[PDB]
Amino acid sequence: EHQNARELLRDVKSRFEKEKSNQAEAQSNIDQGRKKVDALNKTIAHLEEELTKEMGGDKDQMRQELEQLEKANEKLREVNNSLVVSLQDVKNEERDIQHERESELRTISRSIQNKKVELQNIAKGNDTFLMNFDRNMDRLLRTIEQRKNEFETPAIGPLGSLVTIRKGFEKWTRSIQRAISSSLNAFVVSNPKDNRLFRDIMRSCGIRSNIPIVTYCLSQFDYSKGRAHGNYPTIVDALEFSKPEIECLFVDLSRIERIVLIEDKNEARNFLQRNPVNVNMALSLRDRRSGFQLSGGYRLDTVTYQDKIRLKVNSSSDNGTQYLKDLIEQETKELQNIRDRYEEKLSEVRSRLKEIDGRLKSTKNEMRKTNFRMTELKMNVGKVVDTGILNSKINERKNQEQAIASYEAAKEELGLKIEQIAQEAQPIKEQYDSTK
Amino acid sequence: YKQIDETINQLVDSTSPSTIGIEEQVADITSTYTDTLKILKVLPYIWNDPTCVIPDLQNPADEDDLQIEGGKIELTCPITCKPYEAPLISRKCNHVFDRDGIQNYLQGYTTRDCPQAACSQVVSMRDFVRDPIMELRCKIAKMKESQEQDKRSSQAIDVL
Amino acid sequence: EIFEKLNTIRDEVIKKKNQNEYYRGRTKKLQATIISTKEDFLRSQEILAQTHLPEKSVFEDIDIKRKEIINKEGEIRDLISEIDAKANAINHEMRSIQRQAESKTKSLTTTDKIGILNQDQDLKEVRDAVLMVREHPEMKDKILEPPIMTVSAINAQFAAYLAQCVDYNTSKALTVVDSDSYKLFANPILDKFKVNLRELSSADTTPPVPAETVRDLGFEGYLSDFITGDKRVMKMLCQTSKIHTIPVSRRELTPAQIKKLITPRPNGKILFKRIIHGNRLVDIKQSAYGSKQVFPTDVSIKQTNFYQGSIMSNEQKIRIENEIINLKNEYNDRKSTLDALSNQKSGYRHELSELASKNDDINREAHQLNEIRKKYTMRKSTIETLREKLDQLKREARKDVSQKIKDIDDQIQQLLLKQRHLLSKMAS
Missing domain, CATH: 1.20.120.1010 (Four Helix Bundle (Hemerythrin (Met), subunit A))
Incomplete structure (x- = not known):
């Protein structure tokens, strides 16, 4: 009849709150750590580059740029070499055009080389062609020439005064002289045996000459034969002589006086070609100075002039630089226009000089810009840097985050304990109270 | 009540x-x-x-x-007794000492004096109190x- | 009435009091943190020990290395300023080699006779007229070339002997064998330049007097000693002159001695088309309107060089041209060699630039080493941030724990006063 049971529970209830106390500590540690690490990272997250970019942004992108710049420099030096290869050819053309300028100068001015004012050779004196095969042939002639003129019918021989023309406009006097060129002199002895001997005894000043010898005499057939008419100058009736037939005894091949022979630009074209009848041959010159003897049959012949004063070109008035006027005053204009057509290419080479100079200067400036850039690149690669803080702060964030994860890993099972422990412990509370 | x-x-x-x-x-x-x-x-x-x-x-x-x-x-005290955690006190004049000590301090014979106050008390823990x-x-x-x-x-x- | 609630308070103390240890335990965390961080700061001082301030010349070693890089650039530009001169020199050298080339061609001119025609002024027109025809094939039914180059006369005296065979005008004219082809050939050129042509109708080649014959004593093979050339040109030599019938005994003779031929021969009307004996040449024409007398007329001649394969000779030739040719060749080539040695100097300048690049590499290595040791200095400096992180953290933690102790313990101790509420309605 006693009251038996005593209190038994006050002690066990503690374990519940004892373990529950960790609910505060775990979450407090997690919150403190994560909030503090986030606050500290708030700085670094944007302060990694407070000063790093200002000077640091060059080195990397310019190190990527060097691959362009170095090869572009090589390319521009190579195209500068090609530019020099063009300029050297330009100055090759320069020396060439110098060659052509001297060439054209000489070609146009070689009218000076022999006939500038050569008209004044004798200068008020007197001279003759009577001994002209060498400058010393006069010893052959001077006072022994008289022993020739006795083998002849009316005198034939030197033709000295016979080759002089009376007045007459200058231009036409080429054809008859060209014709007589075949028989320029006609000394002779009738004997056929002395052919060599007489010419050989005529060697009183050597045999360095080309003396011609002719046996032919006056021809005989009348002057009333088919004479032409005067519309353009003819120089057959222009000579004084001992006998008229002197100027006719070669007519067999010098057929000039009995034809309607004309020139190229007048009297209907190409009647020279048209095989004239009742006459033998009438071929005529093409051009006044060098043009050949036009023909429509037997072929042409040249008239490239060759002659000299040989008696006196000036016999009434004697001086120069007045009458023969046009040639030099037009050769000056030829010099002028040749200079023009060469100075156009001189301006071309000047323009090419401007082009190459501008290209070279532009390339020099472009390359010097890149030289400064690559100097600064290769240089600032070795810049001052503060990488230490970046790594330190990143590591501080990382290790702290790992610690936070470790903290979080511990809460769940420790929290799980409490529910089952309380289920075990609590229900006796009502039990002892009911037992009371 | x-x-x-x-x-x-x-x-x-x-x-x-x-x-x-x-x-x-x-x-x-x-x-x-x-x-x-x-x-x-x-x-x-x-x-x-x-x-x-x-x-x-x-x-x-x-x-x-x-x-x-x-x-x-x-x-x-290193020469008199190891640390105290369970003293038991007397009923007369506050004589007190460890519970587990006297069980060997008087191993077999009880009526012995207590060296605590230079006075005579020749009774032991069997008559002591909590x-x-x-x-x-x-x-x-x-x-x-x-x-x-x-x-x-x-x-x-x-x-x- | 009723029996009243009695205490029912009892355990209210526990749920507050027991929280006292909450950060009294954290005190140990505080102490552990301070001791560990103080040891860390001692390690930071150990790091302080190795001062080694950055190298002594940073502020001016920077200027130095700047100077070396600008020296690199200067040397490069200086060397290229002369590589341009090398380009000029090599271009002039190749132009000089070209000059050597055409000079050698002019020198080694082959057996061809083109060169002789250069003696006269306007005959370069004929030279070009033949040159463009030679260069391009076109088609030539009867190809025809100036006869001067197409004959093989024996010697210069014999060249004079046959020079007056045809006139200078003829020598600058092109012969034709098919007389029908008057102008068919001239499609490209027509009449641009100064040349003419020669026709052909007939020719003859028979051995005259080839036996005991019209005279008493025999001598010599007849006048065909050696003259050969183009087929058309030789047909012209026959047609225009008939040289194959002149009675040439190389020794002395006179027309009176020739008069045995006065009677008719395969040669018809009295006398020949032409006579030549040594340096003496004769002309024949009919005396129709004279005394009907037979008349030969003689002319003397001198040396001629055309119609023979030896254009000029080594004795005179165009010779000083060869001397100046080789002379300018030698000067230009030796100037090129001097330029090549200057280019060897330029290669040594390239070597100097490579040595400057070695200097650049060495200086960059030194600067990179110094900058990495500056990174070590930055490592040393990070302890400042370390200690600043420690200082506020430790103090704030200890302040928090101490204030929690103060407040919570005071609150609990004051709540202990609730005890007075228990001395209550029971009696008085």
Whole structure:
């Protein structure tokens, strides 16, 4: 009849709150750590580059740029070499055009080389062609020439005064002289045996000459034969002589006086070609100075002039630089226009000089810009840097985050304990109270 | 009736590290209209120090010298006895010592004197009683004299 | 009435009091943190021990290395300023080699007779007229070339001997064998330049007097000693002159001695088309309107060089041209060799630039080493952030724990006063 049971529970209830106390500590540690690490990272997250970019942004992108710049420099030096290869050819053309300028100068001015004012050779004196095969042939002639003129019918021989023309406009006097060129002199002895001997005894000043010898005499057939008419100058009736037939005894091949022979630009074209009848041959010159003897049959012949004063070109008035006027005053204009057509290419080479100079200067400036850039690149690669803080702060964030994860890993099972422990412990509370 | 008694037993909650003064609030606890009340009548002075003496047996007013003949309530001694955790007190004049000690200090023969006060007492623990008087002493002593270690060391090491 | 609730408070203390240890335990965490961090700061001082301030010349070693890089650039530009001169020199050298080429061609001119025609002024027109025809094939039914180059006369005196065979005008004219082809040939050129042509109708080649014959004593093989050339040109030599009938005994003779031929021969009307004996040449024409007398007329001649394969000779030739040719060749080639040695100097300048690049590499290595040791200095400096992180953290943690102790313990101790509420409605 006693009251038996005593209190038994006050002690066990503690374990519940004892373990529950960790609910505060775990979450407090997690919150403190994560909030503090986030606050500290708030700085670094944007302060990694407070000063790093200002000077640091060059080195990397310019190190990527060097691959362009170095090869572009090589390319521009190579195209500068090609530019020099063009300029050297330009100055090759320069020396060439110098060659052509001297060439054209000489070609146009070689009218000076022999006939500038050569008209004044004798200068008020007197001279003759009577001994002209060498400058010393006069010893052959001077006072022994008289022993020739006795083998002849009316005198034939030197033709000295016979080759002089009376007045007459200058231009036409080429054809008859060209014709007589075949028989320029006609000394002779009738004997056929002395052919060599007489010419050989005529060697009183050597045999360095080309003396011609002719046996032919006056021809005989009348002057009333088919004479032409005067519309353009003819120089057959222009000579004084001992006998008229002197100027006719070669007519067999010098057929000039009995034809309607004309020139190229007048009297209907190409009647020279048209095989004239009742006459033998009438071929005529093409051009006044060098043009050949036009023909429509037997072929042409040249008239490239060759002659000299040989008696006196000036016999009434004697001086120069007045009458023969046009040639030099037009050769000056030829010099002028040749200079023009060469100075156009001189301006071309000047323009090419401007082009190459501008290209070279532009390339020099472009390359010097890149030289400064690559100097600064290769240089600032070795810049001052503060990488230490970046790594330190990143590591501080990382290790702290790992610690936070470790903290979080511990809460769940420790929290799980409490529910089952309380289920075990609590229900006796009502039990002892009911037992009371 | 009856159950009105227990109530104030929770008094032992007086244990408080942050105590600054208990002189007044301990008074009215005795109001009522037990051994716990008896020990309450004397224990409050322990907060000052547990090793003091103010004997009701000679005079509760004032002390005579600083010698006790019965000890300063020591806790350990390397040449006399290992630390104290379970003392048992006498019923006559406060003779007290460890429970587990005398069982071998008097192994076989009981009537022997007690070397504690230079006086004759030749009876042993079989007539002793449970000791509720010791509870406060070591508990307050350690709580008071261990908390000074942290502050000085912390302030000496925090210089930099 | 009723029996009242009695205490029912009892355990209310526990749920507040027991929280006292909550950060009294954290005190140990505080102490562990301070001790560990103080040891860390001692390690930071150990790091302080190795001062080695960055190298003494940073602020001016930077200027130095700047100077070396600008020296690299300067040397490169200086060397290229002369590689341009090398380009000029090599271009002039190749032009000089071209000059050497055409000079050698002019020198080693082959057996061809083209060169002789250069003696006269306007005959370069004929030269070009033949040159463009030679260069391009076209089609020539009867190919025809100036006869001067297409004959093999024996010697210069014999060249004179046959020079008056045809006139200078003829020598600058192109013969034709198919008389029908008057102008068919001239499609490209027509009449641009100064040349003419010669016709052909007949020719003859028979051995005259090849036996005991019209005279008493024999002598010599007849006048065909050696004259050969183009088929058309030789047909012309026959048609226009008939040289194959002149009675040439190389020694002395006179027309009176020739008069045994006065009577008719395969040669018809009295006398020949032409006579030549040594340096003496004769002309024949009919005296139709004279005394009907037979008349030969003689002319003397001198040396001629055309119609023979030896254009000029080593004795005179166009010779000083060869001397100047080789002379300018030698000067230009030796100038090119001097330029090549200057280019060897330029290659040594390239070597100097490579040595400058070695200097650049060494200086960059030194600067990179110094910058990595500056990174070590930055490592040393990070302890400042370390200690600043420690200082506020430790103090704030200790403040928080101490204030929690203060407040919570005071709150619990004051709640202990609830005890007074228990001395209550039981009696008085």
